[PDB]
Amino acid sequence: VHIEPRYRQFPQLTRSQLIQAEFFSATMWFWILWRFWHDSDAVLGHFPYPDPSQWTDEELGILPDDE
Amino acid sequence: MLKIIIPTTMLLPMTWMSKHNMIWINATVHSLLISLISLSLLNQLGENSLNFSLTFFSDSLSAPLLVLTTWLLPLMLMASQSHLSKETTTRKKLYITMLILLQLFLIMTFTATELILFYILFEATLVPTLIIITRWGNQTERLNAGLYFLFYTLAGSLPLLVALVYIQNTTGSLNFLIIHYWSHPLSNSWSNIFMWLACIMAFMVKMPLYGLHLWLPKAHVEAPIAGSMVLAAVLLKLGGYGMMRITTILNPLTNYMAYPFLMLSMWGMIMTSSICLRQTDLKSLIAYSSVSHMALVIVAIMIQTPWSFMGATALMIAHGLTSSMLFCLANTNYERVHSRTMILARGLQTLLPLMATWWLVASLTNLALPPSINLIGELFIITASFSWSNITIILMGMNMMITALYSLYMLITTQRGKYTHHINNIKPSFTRENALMALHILPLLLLTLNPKMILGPLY
Amino acid sequence: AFSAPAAYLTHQQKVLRLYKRALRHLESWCVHRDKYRYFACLMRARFDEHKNEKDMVKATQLLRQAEEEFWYGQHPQPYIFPESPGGTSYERYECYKVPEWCLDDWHPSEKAMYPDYFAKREQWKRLRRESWEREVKQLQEETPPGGPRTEALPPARKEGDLPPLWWHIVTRPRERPM
Amino acid sequence: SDAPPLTLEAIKDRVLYVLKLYDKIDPEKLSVNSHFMKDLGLDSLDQVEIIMAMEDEFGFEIPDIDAEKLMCPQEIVDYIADKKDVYE
Amino acid sequence: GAHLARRYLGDASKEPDPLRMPTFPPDYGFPERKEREMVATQQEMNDAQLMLQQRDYCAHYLIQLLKCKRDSFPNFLACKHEQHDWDYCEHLDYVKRMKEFERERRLLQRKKRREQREAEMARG
Amino acid sequence: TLCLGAITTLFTALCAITQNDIKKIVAFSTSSQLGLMMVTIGINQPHLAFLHICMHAFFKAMLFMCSGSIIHSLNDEQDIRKMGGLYKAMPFTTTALIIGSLALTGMPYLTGFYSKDLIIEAVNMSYTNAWALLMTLIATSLTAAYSTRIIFFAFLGKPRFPPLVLINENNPLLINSIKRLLIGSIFAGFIISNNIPPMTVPNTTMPLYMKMTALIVTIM
Amino acid sequence: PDSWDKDVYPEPPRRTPAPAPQTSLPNPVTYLTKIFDLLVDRPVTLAREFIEQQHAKNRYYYYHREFRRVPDITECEEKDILCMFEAEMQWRRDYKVDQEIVNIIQERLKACQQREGESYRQNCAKELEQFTQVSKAFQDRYSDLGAHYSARKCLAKQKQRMLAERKAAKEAAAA
Amino acid sequence: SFPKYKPSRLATLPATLDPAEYDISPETRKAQAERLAIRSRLKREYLLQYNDPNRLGVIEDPALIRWTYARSANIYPNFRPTPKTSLLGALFGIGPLFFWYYVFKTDRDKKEKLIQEGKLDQTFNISY
Amino acid sequence: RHSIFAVTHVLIPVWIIHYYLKYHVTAKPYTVVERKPRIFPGDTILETGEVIPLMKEFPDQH
Amino acid sequence: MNPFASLTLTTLTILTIPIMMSNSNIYKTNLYPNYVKTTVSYAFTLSLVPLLMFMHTGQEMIISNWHWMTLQTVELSLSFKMDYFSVMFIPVALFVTWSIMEFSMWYMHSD
Amino acid sequence: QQERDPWYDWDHPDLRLNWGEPIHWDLDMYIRNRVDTSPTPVSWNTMCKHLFGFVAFMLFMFWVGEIYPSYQPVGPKQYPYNDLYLERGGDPTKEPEPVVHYEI
Numbered sequence A: 001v002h003i004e005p006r007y008r009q010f011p012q013l014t015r016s017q018l019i020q021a022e023f024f025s026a027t028m029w030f031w032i033l034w035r036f037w038h039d040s041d042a043v044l045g046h047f048p049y050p051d052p053s054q055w056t057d058e059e060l061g062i063l064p065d066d067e
Numbered sequence B: 001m002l003k004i005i006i007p008t009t010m011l012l013p014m015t016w017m018s019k020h021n022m023i024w025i026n027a028t029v030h031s032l033l034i035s036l037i038s039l040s041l042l043n044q045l046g047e048n049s050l051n052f053s054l055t056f057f058s059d060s061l062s063a064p065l066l067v068l069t070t071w072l073l074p075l076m077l078m079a080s081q082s083h084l085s086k087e088t089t090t091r092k093k094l095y096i097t098m099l100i101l102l103q104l105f106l107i108m109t110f111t112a113t114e115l116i117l118f119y120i121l122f123e124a125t126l127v128p129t130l131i132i133i134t135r136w137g138n139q140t141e142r143l144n145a146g147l148y149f150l151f152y153t154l155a156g157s158l159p160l161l162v163a164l165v166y167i168q169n170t171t172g173s174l175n176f177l178i179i180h181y182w183s184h185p186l187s188n189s190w191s192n193i194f195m196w197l198a199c200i201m202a203f204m205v206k207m208p209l210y211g212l213h214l215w216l217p218k219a220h221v222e223a224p225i226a227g228s229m230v231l232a233a234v235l236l237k238l239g240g241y242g243m244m245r246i247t248t249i250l251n252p253l254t255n256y257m258a259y260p261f262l263m264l265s266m267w268g269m270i271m272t273s274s275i276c277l278r279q280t281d282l283k284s285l286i287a288y289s290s291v292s293h294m295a296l297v298i299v300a301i302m303i304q305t306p307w308s309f310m311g312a313t314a315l316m317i318a319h320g321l322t323s324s325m326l327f328c329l330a331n332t333n334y335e336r337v338h339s340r341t342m343i344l345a346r347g348l349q350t351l352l353p354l355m356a357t358w359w360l361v362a363s364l365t366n367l368a369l370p371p372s373i374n375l376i377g378e379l380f381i382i383t384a385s386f387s388w389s390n391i392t393i394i395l396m397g398m399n400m401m402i403t404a405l406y407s408l409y410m411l412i413t414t415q416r417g418k419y420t421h422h423i424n425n426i427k428p429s430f431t432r433e434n435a436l437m438a439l440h441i442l443p444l445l446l447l448t449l450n451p452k453m454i455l456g457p458l459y
Numbered sequence C: 001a002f003s004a005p006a007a008y009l010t011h012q013q014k015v016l017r018l019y020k021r022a023l024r025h026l027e028s029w030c031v032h033r034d035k036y037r038y039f040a041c042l043m044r045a046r047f048d049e050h051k052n053e054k055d056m057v058k059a060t061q062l063l064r065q066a067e068e069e070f071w072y073g074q075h076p077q078p079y080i081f082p083e084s085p086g087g088t089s090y091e092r093y094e095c096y097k098v099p100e101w102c103l104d105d106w107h108p109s110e111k112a113m114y115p116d117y118f119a120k121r122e123q124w125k126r127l128r129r130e131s132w133e134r135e136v137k138q139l140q141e142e143t144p145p146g147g148p149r150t151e152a153l154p155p156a157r158k159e160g161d162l163p164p165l166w167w168h169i170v171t172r173p174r175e176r177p178m
Numbered sequence D: 001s002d003a004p005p006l007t008l009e010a011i012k013d014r015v016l017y018v019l020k021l022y023d024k025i026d027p028e029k030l031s032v033n034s035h036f037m038k039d040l041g042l043d044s045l046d047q048v049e050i051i052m053a054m055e056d057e058f059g060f061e062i063p064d065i066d067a068e069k070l071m072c073p074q075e076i077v078d079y080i081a082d083k084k085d086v087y088e
Numbered sequence E: 001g002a003h004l005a006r007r008y009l010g011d012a013s014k015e016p017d018p019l020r021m022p023t024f025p026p027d028y029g030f031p032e033r034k035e036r037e038m039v040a041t042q043q044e045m046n047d048a049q050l051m052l053q054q055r056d057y058c059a060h061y062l063i064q065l066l067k068c069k070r071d072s073f074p075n076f077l078a079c080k081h082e083q084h085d086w087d088y089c090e091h092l093d094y095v096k097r098m099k100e101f102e103r104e105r106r107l108l109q110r111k112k113r114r115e116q117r118e119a120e121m122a123r124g
Numbered sequence F: 001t002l003c004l005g006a007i008t009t010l011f012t013a014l015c016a017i018t019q020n021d022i023k024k025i026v027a028f029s030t031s032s033q034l035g036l037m038m039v040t041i042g043i044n045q046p047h048l049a050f051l052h053i054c055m056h057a058f059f060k061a062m063l064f065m066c067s068g069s070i071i072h073s074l075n076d077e078q079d080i081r082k083m084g085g086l087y088k089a090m091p092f093t094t095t096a097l098i099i100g101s102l103a104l105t106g107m108p109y110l111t112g113f114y115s116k117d118l119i120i121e122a123v124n125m126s127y128t129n130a131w132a133l134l135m136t137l138i139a140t141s142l143t144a145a146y147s148t149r150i151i152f153f154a155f156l157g158k159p160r161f162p163p164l165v166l167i168n169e170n171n172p173l174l175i176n177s178i179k180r181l182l183i184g185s186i187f188a189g190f191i192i193s194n195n196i197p198p199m200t201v202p203n204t205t206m207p208l209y210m211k212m213t214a215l216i217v218t219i220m
Numbered sequence G: 001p002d003s004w005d006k007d008v009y010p011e012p013p014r015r016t017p018a019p020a021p022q023t024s025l026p027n028p029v030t031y032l033t034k035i036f037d038l039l040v041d042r043p044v045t046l047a048r049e050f051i052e053q054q055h056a057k058n059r060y061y062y063y064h065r066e067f068r069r070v071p072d073i074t075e076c077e078e079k080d081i082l083c084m085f086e087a088e089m090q091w092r093r094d095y096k097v098d099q100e101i102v103n104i105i106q107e108r109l110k111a112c113q114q115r116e117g118e119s120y121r122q123n124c125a126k127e128l129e130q131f132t133q134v135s136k137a138f139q140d141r142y143s144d145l146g147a148h149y150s151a152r153k154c155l156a157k158q159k160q161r162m163l164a165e166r167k168a169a170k171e172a173a174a175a
Numbered sequence H: 001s002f003p004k005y006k007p008s009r010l011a012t013l014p015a016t017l018d019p020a021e022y023d024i025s026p027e028t029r030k031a032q033a034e035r036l037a038i039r040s041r042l043k044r045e046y047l048l049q050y051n052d053p054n055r056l057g058v059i060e061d062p063a064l065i066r067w068t069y070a071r072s073a074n075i076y077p078n079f080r081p082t083p084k085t086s087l088l089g090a091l092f093g094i095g096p097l098f099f100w101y102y103v104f105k106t107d108r109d110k111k112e113k114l115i116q117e118g119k120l121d122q123t124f125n126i127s128y
Numbered sequence I: 001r002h003s004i005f006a007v008t009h010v011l012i013p014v015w016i017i018h019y020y021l022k023y024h025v026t027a028k029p030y031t032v033v034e035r036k037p038r039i040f041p042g043d044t045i046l047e048t049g050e051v052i053p054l055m056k057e058f059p060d061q062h
Numbered sequence J: 001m002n003p004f005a006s007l008t009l010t011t012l013t014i015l016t017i018p019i020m021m022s023n024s025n026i027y028k029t030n031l032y033p034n035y036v037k038t039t040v041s042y043a044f045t046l047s048l049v050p051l052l053m054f055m056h057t058g059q060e061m062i063i064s065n066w067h068w069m070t071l072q073t074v075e076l077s078l079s080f081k082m083d084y085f086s087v088m089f090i091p092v093a094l095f096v097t098w099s100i101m102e103f104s105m106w107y108m109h110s111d
Numbered sequence K: 001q002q003e004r005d006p007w008y009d010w011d012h013p014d015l016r017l018n019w020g021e022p023i024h025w026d027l028d029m030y031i032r033n034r035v036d037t038s039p040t041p042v043s044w045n046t047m048c049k050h051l052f053g054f055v056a057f058m059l060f061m062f063w064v065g066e067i068y069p070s071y072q073p074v075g076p077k078q079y080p081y082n083d084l085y086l087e088r089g090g091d092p093t094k095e096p097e098p099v100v101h102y103e104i
């Protein structure tokens, strides 16, 4: 490989470097999309977070403000 | 142990009967052989000492010191023959005679079984050193340096003589084994306090203790290279050896008489390390380094624990080797440029690469890089001090940081940067200088490989 | 770095230096080229607005004001050329520079390689040895009685003279020595 | 490898290129020995701008004391060649 | 979160203290309460060497997951059912803890309001 | 430890967002990630901190490597103010730097995500200093901000470098090294996460908004 | 192996589970282990067999040195130098032996902590108890003697401890 | 107009911000001329030996010698015991010693008192 | 000439290391210590042949 | 003999051979950097095996091979811990060092 | 020595000194590997105020956030065998006070 100076012009590019760069960008994006398609729980959370206010006093066992 | 003493006494007429052009060769070869013979003293026992006769004995504390002395003689011979080339034959033989007499006195000092004989030899070591300094020094300050070296020592040592003869009249013996077996506690009275001071101050001034060290920069800077080597490597360790010997009869008074000397040692350690940061003379920096390391040794001896004694022994050996190497490294540049100023010759790594490697290794051992025996001793002393009191780590911690700073300051000032343009007489390093540095440095790492040989009798 | 300095700078010299400094720091602030061109033209117009002031006192007062404004509005991290005294490659190759006198101490086996180079070196050394006294005497003649007043040196004038004090300027190590 | 071995011809070509991209200097009337003050009629500020343009082109700064002195493209080329150790 | 704002800005008197919790007896409001049982033996947990923190009430699912992982070593994508079961058990544990916190807040709010209004009845 | 890590990560992420030397930006990024590691240790999650060390090594080394490639191509120039449009002039370097920036910012399913996402969601569900949590969130926003600065300044726009164009990244050693580190930065997170035994108790129950906190702050 | 006594350095009975493959895939660890065995462990074994064959043709023994028991420092007169010397030597040997006993106990403790893994806090209680006991005994015997220790100072320490214990016991008896 | 910059010891005043260099006198120009003359004479004296072909060695610098001598040997002859000298010497040579003595003595007295009462937790403290 | 690097830099060093560990290091107690292998329910021990029972009738929260 | 320990020690030991070769006629040629890079890559692929053993059975070890020195009650010995942290960090560091050395073969070509 | 002109032809370029000129008493403190007194863009006594303010504000806010912690609305974690009494240090011969957890 021989690449000579250009003096105020766009430098000389060989096909292999663009091929490699595009290949690795594509494989990164494919990996991200595939791993999100198969492991969405790792980002969105897996189990529903409950709300304390909607718990009845029967299962929480608090007296009806009398005793 | 006459198998070591007699060969040195034979070195004397061998030097005085040699041809005019073989004195260095003969002295070096037979000094190295004597060192090889003295290597046999390292086979020590676990319970008592080697009691050769009524007069001489070898412990696990004095055997490494004897080996260091006998190994230091040939190195001094190699270091001296460069600047003594224009000297006459008779004066060269007299110089070698002074060195041989110094070795003989040192060898007999470390093995004397009695305290008065030890005193006589430890004081006889003065005459050859004073003659060497005042006769073969370069500048006119050498006379004052000799006076300072003499009187600082004698003013401490004479009360020791009085105390020793008094102790012999009281207990009937000065033999060290009898003294150890028949030890009795010291009461708390003014007479006992002054006896303690008389027994301690001579060794304190030999270390030297901070505030009593002014003689050391003068003597170690104004001396010739062999004088500096033997002053830093062996003669300072006389104080530590004598203090560990004499402290046997000073208990339990030491428990509180050690406080002023401990405070002086720690604070003056900080002070001398700081002094090393602003020093224009390269040799004075190495001298003040010696003062800091010896302050650590004083602390270790004063707190009186097995770990502190082990650390003191290891540190004394390591410092002897390292400081002798540093003095030789500085003397090479001095012989090249005839000046001691540190910022005169710079960028020397460009001109002398192998000497730069030697500088790097010497300054790495000075800052106690693990697992060098320098760090083994320093860490043992630091642990012992921490057990003594948890607040010593702060002072000890500050010292470690400062020592690294000034060591690397010396290295960067001398080796890095750009070479001074006007100096064009920097010749390549001779084989002799490289061999000198190698013979300094290789035993250090070899001893790191087997550290129980320098850890003292408390091991 | 090559010219001998003068005892002081002049007012126009100070104005030119401030103009260059301000343009450089403005370029540091204006990263893009078109914006820099716009504000550099504005700066040039501002500089040449007061170009025709015949009162030197007010000229120096304006210069003082401009320097104060520059110090207030300078870029804290201005662009520096890599080999300029604050750049990332300022003294990078100084450790590779070796003075020429070191070659005098090479072992004869080392000098056995490169015979022609050392022959040329001997020719250069003979040239210096022959020209030294003429250089010294020319300096002696051209120097005023009360010692030199600037650091400028005279050139060669005679038949085959050399400009005095030339050896260490001509035999510089290199800018990329190794 | 690294950048090619810059030569005097390349230095002169680049200097003339930069000077002919200057709007205040006519291309044909400009010559390699043309003076900036006398021949081309530029003031000091234009000379400073030209020095800065040279610095940008070669990627290295020129000290102000040195910069003030250069007056013709020959002096600029000579200073650049002496700075970068160009002999061919 | 809102509980932090309610405690540090609103009335901290009726807000549960996470360090001191619970303050009511476990059988106070409940007539009877089942004792929470454990599936994995202490010896089994020791033999599996789980951790001092993973030895919770879901430890049996963790033991199953670890055994399946060791058995299906090269295929490190086969331990999904066991991992899901362990996660489900841990989610139920967290739900129970949320419930405990919820229970403490209402009791504190209910008890303190009831006793202050009884004091109000005694104040007239 | 938690407070020291929090102040360190915030301060260094704040210093990084206005630096012009690219090596300085990457160094401050490394210091901020070390602060985040210290924060992770402070909430009693040492195994997460170790996993983050192993995860961060890949993309941090490759980011510095791409910076070195750009520096070498433009005649040892390090200032971003003189770096123009290298998106097209440097295709492979651009691809590697984009992938590394996306991994550093914890983009989902990348190497950075399997450590940083868990670290953030474990800081959120612990009894901890609130100021430390706030500084951690601000720092993880500033991370995306500094990464964006390098890409916009170094790769987008028009050239600002000297006109003698010597840009050339066609060298097999550089390509192979960066490609190896790039494959690492893409797949190591998934592989190592699935191949280690569970040494933690997972957080399986989060409010939906807090589960997306890292993504939201990164996007902002 | 039989190089050391397994009572001084005990170990548990070493229960290891059998392999239970649950995948159709091969196990790379087993294949790598077979390769390592056949390629490293066999040539090393052959070299060791040759070396041991050479060793068996030259067999000699070294014997552990035995020491008799001499009078202690308590049975010595005040200024009797020879009996004092023998007692001091014997005391120093006993000090070394006690240090080695503590070393053995510490080795047991460290091995237990490594062996038990995540259950070390519960499964190493006995070794910790033994180390606590031995450490307490050793500390009483030799701690605070300092440099320049001797048998006489140890005896003085023991006498002081006995006096304190006797006074404490007599005062508790009066309660 | 703009906020002002005030110099400090470790952050000095810039030359372009110095009032003294914007109101000048012919006396100042004369002084600058003399300074340049002295500098040039020293430079010529140095360069004459620097380029000398027969010079082998180190060019001696009296300025360096004067600096080292002043920093080392000239200090004691120029010393007078003054109230300032005496106070600074007493403070910086005496205060640290008794400060550290008080600290260490207090720490060790506390430790010994705790040991006497039998509550220091010296368990496992085999090595000292 | 081709693969001699794998012999003088991997095979030879591992021969010396394995020999040094198998016959010298492991000739003293507590020099190589391995944490005990995990045991799970339903496992069988190699040495004793003992099998470990199953795990207390899972509640089957399917 | 359970190759875990031997492989973990060989991984670290083979890294020092090019250091011992620094005074040979390989350090004066232009093949030295590639030699060091090859050594590091070999060390990485060797260290990949103990990692697999750990990921399979969770095996961990400590090796105290050399007894350097002993104090009265404290024994100091050359000891290596081969738990999860070491067997996981060593391959990552070796991989990164291999990549960075191959990069340096191009970046520092003119040094 | 950092404030000296770097574009001047010093006799010693690294030290930025000229042969024979008077040397500052504290040159070794000023060798430009060391203490630098060069003018700064922002004034001294303004950098100090901003730095000290940042440090003090950070410390105060950390203290406040400690006395106002952050947590989730959950109860304490529940461990089966009496808070694993035998696991966290054994002591198998004291029969500790039972720790009992009930369903909810």
Ligand SMILES: CCCCCCCCCCCCCCCCC[C@@H](O)O[C@H](CO[C@H](O)CCCCCCCCCCCCCCC)COP(=O)(O)OCC[N+](C)(C)C
Pocket: B188, B189, B190, B193, B210, B211, B212, B257, B260, B261
């Ligand atoms: C520059 C470096 C030189 C080297 C440093 C040498 C260090 C020498 C310091 C000596 C250490 C201690 C010496 C005496 C021990 C105690 C000191 C005394 O102050 O303590 C009290 C003493 O009380 C009073 O202080 C009385 C002493 C006062 C007179 C002493 C003069 C001190 C003035 C400082 C002069 C500087 C001396 C060094 C010259 C350079 C204790 O109370 P007391 O229980 O009753 O005495 C104990 C002795 N008994 C048991 C027999 C009774």
Ligand SMILES: CCCCCCCC/C=C/CCCCCCCC(=O)OC[C@H](COP(=O)(O)OCCN)OC(=O)CCCCCCC/C=C/CCCCCCCC
Pocket: B397, B398, B401, B405, F004, K032, K033, K034, K035, K036
């Ligand atoms: C613990 C005991 C001591 C703790 C530290 C206290 C302060 C130590 C003071 C050190 C004095 C050293 C004097 C000589 C050093 C060598 C000269 C020197 O380094 O000069 C400064 C030199 C050059 O300046 P540059 O900015 O790099 O400019 C280069 C471009 N021209 O840079 C330096 O090295 C300065 C380093 C000094 C740092 C001292 C301040 C550090 C204090 C840390 C306090 C915080 C503790 C951390 C707490 C952690 C939480 C538990």
Ligand SMILES: CCCCCCCCCCCC(=O)SCCNC(=O)CCNC(=O)[C@H](O)C(C)(C)COP(=O)(O)O
Pocket: C011, C012, C013, C015, C016, C022, C025, C026, C029, C046, C047, C048, C049, C050, C051, C052, C053, C059, C062, C063, C066, C067, C069, C070, C073, C074, C075, D043, D044, D045
């Ligand atoms: C990024 C922030 C930094 C920007 C801040 C800087 C703001 C400064 C703008 C205002 C300052 C001025 O214009 S102050 C203008 C001062 N005016 C004079 O000095 C009048 C006399 N003229 C001359 O001395 C020469 O002609 C000379 C003009 C020097 C040209 O030199 P040549 O023609 O012989 O090349």
